[PDB]
Design an enzyme around this catalytic site. Sequence first.
Site, short mmCIF file in Angstrom:
data_model
loop_
_atom_site.label_atom_id
_atom_site.label_comp_id
_atom_site.label_asym_id
_atom_site.label_seq_id
_atom_site.Cartn_x
_atom_site.Cartn_y
_atom_site.Cartn_z
N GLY A 52 -55.03 13.20 -61.69
CA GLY A 52 -55.95 12.51 -60.60
C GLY A 52 -56.95 13.66 -60.22
N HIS B 107 -64.83 11.65 -69.79
CA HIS B 107 -63.68 10.95 -70.21
C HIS B 107 -63.00 9.96 -69.34
CE1 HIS B 107 -61.69 14.56 -67.89
NE2 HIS B 107 -60.89 13.60 -67.71
N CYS C 90 -59.27 15.27 -61.88
CA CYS C 90 -60.57 15.29 -62.89
C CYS C 90 -61.64 14.87 -62.01
CB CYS C 90 -60.31 14.61 -64.02
SG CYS C 90 -59.23 15.25 -65.05
#
Lengths: 302, 302
Positions: free
Chosen positions: B143, B41, B145
């Site tokens: 942040g 993503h 991820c």
Amino acid sequence: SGFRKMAFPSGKVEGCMVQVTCGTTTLNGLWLDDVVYCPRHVICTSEDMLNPNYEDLLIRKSNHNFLVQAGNVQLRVIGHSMQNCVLKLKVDTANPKTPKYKFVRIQPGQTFSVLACYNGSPSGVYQCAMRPNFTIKGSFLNGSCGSVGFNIDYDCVSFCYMHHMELPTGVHAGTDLEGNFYGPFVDRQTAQAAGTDTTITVNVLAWLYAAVINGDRWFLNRFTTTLNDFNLVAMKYNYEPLTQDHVDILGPLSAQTGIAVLDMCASLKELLQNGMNGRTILGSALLEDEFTPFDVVRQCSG
Amino acid sequence: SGFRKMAFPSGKVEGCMVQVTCGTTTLNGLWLDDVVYCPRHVICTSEDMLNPNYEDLLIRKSNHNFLVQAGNVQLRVIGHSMQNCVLKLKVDTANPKTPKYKFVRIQPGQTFSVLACYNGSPSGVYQCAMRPNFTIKGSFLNGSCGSVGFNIDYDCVSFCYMHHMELPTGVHAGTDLEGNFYGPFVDRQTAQAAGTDTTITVNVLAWLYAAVINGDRWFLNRFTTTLNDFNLVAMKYNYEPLTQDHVDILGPLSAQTGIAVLDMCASLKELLQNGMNGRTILGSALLEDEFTPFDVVRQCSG
Ligand SMILES: *[C@](O)(C(=O)NC1CC1)[C@H](C[C@@H]1CCCNC1=O)NC(=O)[C@H](CC1CCCCC1)NC(=O)c1cc2ccccc2o1
Ligand SMILES: *[C@](O)(C(=O)NC1CC1)[C@H](C[C@@H]1CCCNC1=O)NC(=O)[C@H](CC1CCCCC1)NC(=O)c1cc2ccccc2o1
């Protein structure tokens, strides 16, 4: 969101751990530039551990009595000296992995990360707080002496703790990196024991704020209290007095949540007087006191 | 002695963290040999986060749309591909800090360390367990991820988790390193929520054994119970069934303490039925279920 007991990333410290052997005693050392730091009781024998004269013991040693192993490389010892309860072994090689660093001494109620090590090999990392009675509730087995505690700010490792012993209650005692013990402890076998401890009030309040930031609000109330009435309760429950400086330090968290520090104190008073009635806060059924206001701010959203 | 939630030393993983930017989306990636792994993503826009067709989105990208920053060095992307919910960016430089590693998938009730990272920079390390409902109770802000979860055996890093999202209850969901989600979660904004959870019985019993090894014995009793009567109680309190394989796995701890596994079960039954009557165990007023039998053995004395 979420709140966990979080340690600093340990890589920078892992690069500095070595094994130090004297005689049949092996423990960990900390290699920074061309010096290895370790607990001076590496020079003791099970024969003089009761009342050692370390100056005498050290005088009878030479450089070649110390074997220093960094990974699978022998570091040649080229000088040795004592500083308080730590030994400084000068080696012929500067550690190329030396981080920017400082030797700080911390205050009771401050936290730090511990890198548990055995035979110079790191095995685990965890977060600790220095208790008001200068002990730490650590996790240390035989072989762990020489393991260090540290904080990291930007690129800079502030070493604050070297591990020396375990007390009868299962808690731990050691020194700063200058070899000065935290607390009224000595590196000799005696009946020494932890003194009475107290709860770190400002940290409990910081953790209540963390709980609010993370959506636990059930313990809030419309009440308020003065500092003095709060401290009467604190004294009753063996909590440390709350000072105006603590109130000031909690300011950011108070502003972020909109909950005045003395309103949070009213909540803590109610929790002390009534318990939790079967509920939890951030997954705990006890009031947690090992998170500083800084720890909460660093971990929690803005 | 002492018992703490301990993470693995993070150095080996710290050497692999990088920053991956696509458009205005920046997150973390994991650099191993000449490949960077990150959540797919990173290619989404706030415009198509509801129902993205990732195959379409990826087809419209080229290598130069991906900026990879390792420390202060730009890594040139020379290929890109999707594998399930992770993106593999081939880069022109092999990571010289690549550890021995494996991609494993873990089971609910197993633990692992998480290295929380922001903008490719590690900020903290902590220990987690995969819950029976395939979520983790983590600590993750925007942040984060791309942060990974791992275990270390000898020299070998077994990566088991990459972080993708947070659910409405504050718990976290992600994938293994092959991009397959843990649990019935998807990388698209929906009403998705954690399913009902249960307590990991074998881990609670492991932690009771840790408590005994560390001198907490107040919850022991002279009683015993059968597996089936114990499991009737377990069911009642939303604990997982205890199997004979769990009993077998607890064997070492049972032998080290001299407390038969079914005697410990009798103790756990009494604690479930009566609570703790104001006492604690290893510093907790709740029964802890995030330590596996392996965690206890590794940390506790022999
Ligand atoms: C370290 O010296 C160490 O790890 N040494 C390496 C060479 C093996 C240990 C660490 C201890 C070990 C026991 C379990 N947890 C822990 O943290 N420190 C000691 O053993 C310490 C040594 C004395 C020697 C003189 C200088 C400092 C103290 N002794 C104790 O911790 C201790 C506890 C008890 C309890 C009952 C009798 C004796 C005793 O010693
Ligand atoms: C990561 O994508 C991330 O860190 N991205 C970097 C670029 C900034 C986040 C991590 C989240 C952030 C929120 C707080 N904790 C946390 O772990 N993941 C998301 O934001 C995730 C993204 C969607 C996009 C499509 C693919 C996967 C999911 N969304 C959520 O976590 C989430 C939670 C809610 C709640 C209410 C509305 C929307 C929502 O999205």
